Amino acid sequence: GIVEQCCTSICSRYQLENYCN
Amino acid sequence: GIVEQCCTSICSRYQLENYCN
Amino acid sequence: HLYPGEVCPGMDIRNNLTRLHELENCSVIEGHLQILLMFKTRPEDFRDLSFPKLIMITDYLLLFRVYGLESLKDLFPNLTVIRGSRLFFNYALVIFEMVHLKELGLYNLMNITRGSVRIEKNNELCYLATIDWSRILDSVEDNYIVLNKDDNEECGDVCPGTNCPATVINGQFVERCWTHSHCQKVCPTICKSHGCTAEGLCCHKECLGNCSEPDDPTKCVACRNFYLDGQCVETCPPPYYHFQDWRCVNFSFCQDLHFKCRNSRCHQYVIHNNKCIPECPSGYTMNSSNLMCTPCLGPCPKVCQILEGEKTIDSVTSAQELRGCTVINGSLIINIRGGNNLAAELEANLGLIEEISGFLKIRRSYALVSLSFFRKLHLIRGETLEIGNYSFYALDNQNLRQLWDWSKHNLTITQGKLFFHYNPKLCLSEIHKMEEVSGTKGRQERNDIALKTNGDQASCENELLKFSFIRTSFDKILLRWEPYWPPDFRDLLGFMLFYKEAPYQNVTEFSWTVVDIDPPQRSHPGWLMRGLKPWTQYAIFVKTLVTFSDERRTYGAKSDIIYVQTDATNPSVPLDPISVSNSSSQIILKWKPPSDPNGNITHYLVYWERQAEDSELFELDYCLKGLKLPSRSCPKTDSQILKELEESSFRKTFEDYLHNVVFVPRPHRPFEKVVNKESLVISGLRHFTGYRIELQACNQDSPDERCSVAAYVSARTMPEAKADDIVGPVTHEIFENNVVHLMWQEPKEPNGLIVLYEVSYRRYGDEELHLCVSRKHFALERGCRLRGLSPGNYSVRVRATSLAGNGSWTEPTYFYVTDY
Amino acid sequence: HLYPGEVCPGMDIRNNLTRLHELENCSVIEGHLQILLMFKTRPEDFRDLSFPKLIMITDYLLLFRVYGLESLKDLFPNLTVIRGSRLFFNYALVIFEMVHLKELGLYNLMNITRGSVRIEKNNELCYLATIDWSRILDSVEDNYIVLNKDDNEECGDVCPGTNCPATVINGQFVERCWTHSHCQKVCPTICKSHGCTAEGLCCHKECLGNCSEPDDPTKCVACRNFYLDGQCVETCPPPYYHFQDWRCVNFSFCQDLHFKCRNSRCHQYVIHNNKCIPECPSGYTMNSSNLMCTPCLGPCPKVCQILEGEKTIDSVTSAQELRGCTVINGSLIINIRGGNNLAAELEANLGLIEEISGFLKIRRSYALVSLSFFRKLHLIRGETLEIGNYSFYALDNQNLRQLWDWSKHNLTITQGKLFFHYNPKLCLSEIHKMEEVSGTKGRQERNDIALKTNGDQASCENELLKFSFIRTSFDKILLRWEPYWPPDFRDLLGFMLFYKEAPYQNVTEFSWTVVDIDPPQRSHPGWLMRGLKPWTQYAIFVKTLVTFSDERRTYGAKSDIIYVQTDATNPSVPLDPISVSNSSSQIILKWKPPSDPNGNITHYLVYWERQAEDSELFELDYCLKGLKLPSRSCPKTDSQILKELEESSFRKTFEDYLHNVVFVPRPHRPFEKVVNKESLVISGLRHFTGYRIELQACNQDSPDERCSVAAYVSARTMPEAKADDIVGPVTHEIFENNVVHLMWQEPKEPNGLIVLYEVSYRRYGDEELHLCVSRKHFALERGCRLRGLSPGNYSVRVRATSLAGNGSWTEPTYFYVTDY
Amino acid sequence: VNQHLCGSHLVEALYLVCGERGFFYTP
Amino acid sequence: VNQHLCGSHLVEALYLVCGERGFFYTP
C-alpha cells in the first residue's frame, strides 16, 4: 500500500500521481 | 577432568578406581 | 413501514457531492457506505441535502475527512440498523479525522448487530458522553472513542431535562441526548431488542429498533432476522432462499446473479442448505443444470490461494477473508496489535482450516491468551519457510499462556525449525510438549528457543515444596518445609518467602513482602516470622532460588500457597470515652470499639467509684476576701543481586578447577457487663459526686478475661432544686446585754458541701446589713452571733452557699431588742 | 644467611607423610609445593616434624584437606618469600578445606611477589583478621578470605599488647599477631621492601624481607632480584645468565639441562638475551653448536598448538600457558567468572598473539570492561567455527563496554558470522563499527545481534538535545528544549525529565526523579518544575521516549546533563532561642542558626523593648489573706507502561490500515547588628525588669532586607540587693490622744515595685506586734498610723516587700507616749 | 522536498500534490 | 548408589571408594 512506500521508504514526486485521477 | 564426568554426567563405580592407585 | 425503493449495492463517494445524489432512490444499502476525502466543501453545502429514505446499512459506515459536515442529523435522519456483515478493521461505524463536525445527530440508530464504533480525532465533536452505547452495542468494552472535544475541552452538553432519560453508566445517573434537542430513545427492559413505540409498548417479537403499531410484523422499520414481501419471517419459506443474511429471494434472482457473473468479468453464486451463497463449502460442487452443490464423492477441500503466499491477520475483517477455508495455500502471520480479546470472532472465522502449506507466525500479539482458536489445525507442511528456515515463529507475545490443549489436540510439522522469544507468560514445558507432540524433537538448534525470556514472568517450577511444621503464636509464625536439593546442590542459593495478609481465601499467585532465607548446611531449613498483627489470616508459600545453567533446564521448585491465621490476644483501649450527665441520678457514657479488636469484641466492663470531696475545702474560712470558689524500598537495584550470583558462581568455579587439577585419571466496687452495646445508662447516683469511670473492651468472658488496661473519665450530675435550701425554722436569742445569737438547721443533705452562710438583718426603715458565716464559724458559734445592735425590730434572712452556687434565702425572721 | 643445601624442584605429597621427608636437605624450592589429601593422620603426627631449612617458594603453596595439622608455625618456621612465577588460579597461597587447623603460624612470611591469597572453608581457623596483608601483598583487594571461624563464630583473638604493632585497616587501630605468641613484624615506612632488623634499621637495597646485618648484601635471607654465590645483584654478570627469574647460572648448567632434555623424554632450554629460557620467542632459532637463538631470516611465528583446538581461559595461570604466543592454532574461550579486573595480567600474558586460527568467544565475563588486552590481534581466520557457524561469540558479559579502540585498531575476520547477546553495557554503535571495520558487513542474518539486550542499560542515544530557554525563580524552574521528531513522528511518545540535587559539579549519568512529559502537537515542548528547595543546584537532562522498531535501528535522542541553581530567598526563623540573665544589668542571648538558610546567613537582627509592669498589681490590698505573690513511588511498571505502548501502537496501526485501504495506486526601639556571631551580651538594663527580645536571622543587609519573621523570647534581669532597702530616717508623730503616725521615705527606685510595708513595734519587755501597710494604705495614711497604744517605750522597725522578695528591716526607732 | 510522510502529513502531502483532479478509487 | 557427585561430596565419595590404596598423581 501507500504507507509502506512513503512512511517507511522515501517518496519522490512521481508516484503520488499514481494515487490521483 | 573428574568434575565433568561426575557432577554433570552420572558416575558409576568402575571409573572411580581410575583416580586411585 | 418496511423497505421501499431500490437496493443500491454499497458505493463510495469521493472528492465532491456530485455523485452523492444516487442515494435518493433506495432505502436499504446492500453493502458499505463510505463518505470520505471531501476537502472543497462548505457548511452550507449539506443543509439542503438530506437522505430520509435510508434505513439500514448491511456492512458498515465510514466517514473520513469530510469538511463542512457539522451534524449527521440531516444526512441520515432514518438510519436505524447497521448489521455489520463485513466490518472495517473490526469496526462497524468509523468517524476519523472528521473536521468541522460538532455532533453526530444519529438519533434513530438503535441496534448495531456486529462490530464496534471507533470515533477518533474530532477536535470539535461533542455530545459523545451523552449517548448510552450499551443500548446499541452488545459489547461496549470494544469501543474506542478518544481524542475528541469532550476530553480535550469542556464543551457544553445541554441535554433537555425538562425529558431525556437518565441511566447509570459507572456510579451516577446522567441524562442521554443525541443533540441539544433530541433525547436518546430508551425502551423498557421488557423490550429486549424488538423496540418500543412512542408510549412504551413492545413491538412484534421479530421486530427491531422501531415500529409503528405494536405486535404487527408488517408495521416494522427493521426486520430482526429476515425480510420478505414487507413481512419479517424467522426462516424463508420455500421456494425462497436466505440471501445475504438479511432478505429472502426466489430461485430466479440467484440464477440471474450466477449467470451475470458467469457471462462477464465476481461471486459466482450457488445454492446450498436453502441459501444462495457465493460459494458452497468443502466437499460440494455445483451442477450444470441446477445451482445446488451436491456432496462430492471424495475429499476435496476448499483451498484459498493467498496472494503473495503470505497473509497478515490483524483484524476481524482480515480474518473474515479466510471464512470457510480448510486448506491454506500460503502462510499466515497472526499480528493483533490490540488490547481486547478477539478470540471469539477469530475462532468463528478461522479454526476451520486443516492444513497450512506455509509457515505460521505469531508476532507482537498483545491481546492473545491462547492459540486454541485453531480448532482443527493438524498439519503445517512448511513448503515455504520464514527467513532462517523456520516453520513456526512466536515472538514478543505479551500474554500468550498456552499454545494448545495437548490432551486432545494433535499437531504435525513436516519441515522447518522452531522459534520462541520474549513470551513472558509461556513456559518451557509447553514448548517441549509441542516439540514432543509435533515430531520436531531433533530439529531445533541452540538459541532457537530462548530460556531467559520464555516464562520469565510466570511461575511454572513444576515441582512441589511441602510444608512440614507450622506453628502459630501471638505475633510469630514458625515455618518449616522439606529440604530440596538440585543435582548440583551448590546451585541452591537459598529460598524466597512471600507473605501477605489475605482477608478472603481466593488469592492470586506469583504487596507480597519478600524475605530471603539462606540454604541449609549439609535439619529442615525453616524460618520464623516477626512483627505480625494478631487475628489475621496470611498467605504463605516458598519459591526456591537456584543458579541458572545455560545448557539444560534452568531448575524448578516451589510450594503451593497456604493460608495461616494468627491467634487472638487482648484488644486495645476503647477510644473517645465521654461521659455526659442528663439527670441528677442519670449519666450517659459514650464510646467506640477500639482500633485493635484483635478478634471479636464480646462485651465491655464498666467500673464505678466515688471521689470523696476534698477535706481541704471543709477547713477554709471563705469569708475572707479572695473567695472565688470554682463553679463545679526494594533490593538495591540489580547490581546487588548480581553480585551475589557472581560470588557464588566464582566459588563454585574455583571448587571445580581445584577438583579438576588435583584428581588425575590414570590410564470490690460496683460494676456490670455490657452485651454488644456502645453506650449505657447509669442510675442510682448521688447528687454532686465525682464519679471516676473505668471502661474496658474485653473479648473473653468465661475462660478468664484477656483484655488490656481501661480508659478513665469523670462525670458530675446536674444541680438539684432544693438540695442547698435551708430547712427548719430560724431560732433567735437575745441576752441581757442585747446579744443576738441565731439558730438555723443546716441542709443536712447538701450538694456536696456548704461553704458559707449569709445573714442579712435590716431594721424597719433602716438599710440591710450583711454578715458572712463560715464553716468553722458555724461550727463554733452554732449559727450567727451579732455584737452590739441598735434597738429596734430587724428582719433575719439566711442563705447557704454550696459548690452549685447561690442558695435560696430563708423566710424573714423578726426580733426586737430592748432600748433600756 | 643465604640459601644452603639443594634446590629440590617442586614436588607433590599425597596420602601419607612417608615421602614428606625429602624436604629436609633443601632451603629453596624451584617449583610448587602441594600438601593435600591427607586423611589418615592425627595431630600428634606433625609436632615432631619440622622444616626450618625452607626459606622461599618460587611458584606457590597449596594446602587442601590435610587432617591433623593445626598450625604451620612448626612445619614452615622460616618461609619468607613466595615469588609466584606460576600461580594456581591467580592465587599464590591457597588453604582450602583444611580441617583441624586453628592458626596459620606463618610468622616469617613478608613478601608475596606475585599472586593473591585465598583461604576458604576452614571452620576452626582463627587469627586471620589479626594479619596486615597490605604489608605482604601489593594488591590486597584481590584476596578472598571467607567461610572461616572468624565470621561464623566469635573465637578469641589474643594478640599480646603488653608489643604487637597496631595499624589502621579501615578506620580503627587493631593489633597484629600471627599467633597468641607471635606479633606480625612490621618495618618502618622508610624500609619499603628491603626489610628491617630487630632494632628497626633498613637492610641492603638488594635485600628483601629479613636480614642479619643492615646494609650487607651477603647477610640477607631473600634476594629481591637475583641470587649468585651468596650475594644479591641487580643483574647477573657475565658469563652468568638469568635463570628462572631468581638465580644466575653458568653456561654449563644450561647446556646440561638442554642435553638432559634432548637425550630423554621437557623444556629443552635455549639461551637468549643473556638468559637461559625454555624457548626463544618468534623470529629466533637455536643453533647446533651453541644454544643462542639467532634472529631468523624470515617471518616464523611461535605457533602454540592448543590441545583439542579449544582452550578456555578463566585464570591467570591458564592465560600464562599462552605467554609468548603469536599465532594460535586453535580457539579461545574467554570466561572469567570473577568480580575483579584481571586485565592487567591478562594483557601481559595475552596480547602478543597476532592471529587466531579458530573462533574467539567471550562468555559470562563479569569483570571484563574491554577487550583491549588483545594489543596485537589482527586476523581471525575462523577455520573452525562455533556451533551455528560463528566466528565471534559474545554472550552475557555484564560489564563489557568497548570491544576495541577503532581509531587505531584494525581487525579482519575471514569466515563465520557474528553473535552478540545480553551485553547490557555494550551498545549497537560499537557492534556496527566492528561490522564495518572487520569486513563482515554482509554476513550476519537476523537475530544474530540482539537489540533489546545490547546496551539496554547504557545511554548511547548518539543524538544531542539542546536546551533553548531556562529561567530560574524562587522554587520554580522553567525548561525549554528544541523539538525532536523521528522519521515517523508518531513514534515519539513523549519525554522523560531527570532532575536531582547536585552539591558538586561531578555527577554521573544514566535518586534521579522522573517526570513524564507528553509530546507536543504539530511551540517548544518545555516543562515547569514545582516544589523546589531554594538555593540549591540541580542536574537536569532530558532523554526521549520512542517506540521500538524491530527491523532497523531503534532511535536515539537525549540531552547532556546541565546544572542550574535556584536563587535565594528569605531564610528561616532561628531555632533554640534562650536568654539567660547572669547579672542585674547583663543578659546573655543564645540561639541556633536557622534550619533553612536559603543562602548565606550574613547577619542577625536583635530588638529590645521593656515590659511595663502591670497596673493591676499597683492597685491591690495585699494585706488581705491570700497574698501569695508570685516570685518573679514507582511506576506501575508493566501493568502500566506496556498498556500505553500498546494503545499508541494500536492507534498507529489503525491509521496505517486506513491509509492502505483508502488510497489505491491506479496503474523605634533599641537594636543592633550581629556580624557572624551566635550570641550577644546586653548591658544598660534596668534592675529586675522583664524584656521582650525580637531576634532575626537575616541574609541581606544593604539591598533591602529579605528575611522572615522573628522569634520571641522573654528575659528578666536579676534584682539588686539594696534596691528594696528602705532609705531615710523614720519619722514618728504622737498626737494629744496618743496616736502614732509614722513617716519613712520609700525606696524610690526599687526592684520594679513595692507591694507592702510591715511595721513591727515592741514595747520594752512586751511582745512584738506586727502591722501590714499596703500600697493604697501607704498612699492614704502617708506611712503607718496606729490607734490606741498602751503607754510605754516601743521600738519601730520597718521593712518593704517587692516582687523580688523580702526587703531588709530598718533601724529601730523608739518613741514614748504619755501615761497621763 | 523529499522526506518521510506518515499520519495526517501523508494526507496533507497528497492534497497539495493533487486534488484539482481528485483522488482515485477503483470502479 | 548412583547419583551426581559435586563439591565436597565428590571428595567423600572418592575417599569411601579408595584411600586404603591412596589417590594417584603423575610422577
UniProtKB/Swiss-Prot annotation, chains A, B:
Superkingdom, taxonomy of origin: Eukaryota
Disulfide linkage: C6-C11
Protein's name according to its UniProt entry: Insulin A chain
Gene name of the encoded protein: INS
Part of the whole protein covered: 90 to 110 of 110
From Swiss-Prot, chains C, D:
Every Fibronectin type-III domain range: 573-648, 664-721, 726-820
Modified residues (Phosphotyrosine): Y366
Residue spans, topological domain Extracellular: 1-667, 668-820
Insulin-binding: annotated span: 655-663
Disulfide bonds: C8-C26, C126-C155, C159-C177, C164-C183, C187-C196, C191-C202, C203-C211, C207-C220, C223-C232, C236-C248, C254-C276, C261-C266, C280-C293, C296-C300, C304-C325, C427-C460, C623-C772, C698-C707
UniProt modified residues of type Phosphoserine: S365, S372
Glycosylation (residues): 16, 25, 78, 111, 210, 250, 287, 329, 389, 410, 506, 582, 600, 793, 806
Site description Insulin-binding, residues in chain: F39
Name recorded for this polypeptide: Insulin receptor subunit alpha
Organism the protein comes from: Mus musculus (Mouse)
Gene: Insr
Whole-protein residues included: 28 to 937 of 1372
Swiss-Prot record, chains E, F:
Name of the protein: Insulin B chain
Gene expressing this chain: INS
Taxonomic lineage from the root: Eukaryota, Metazoa, Chordata, Craniata, Vertebrata
Coiled coil ranges: none
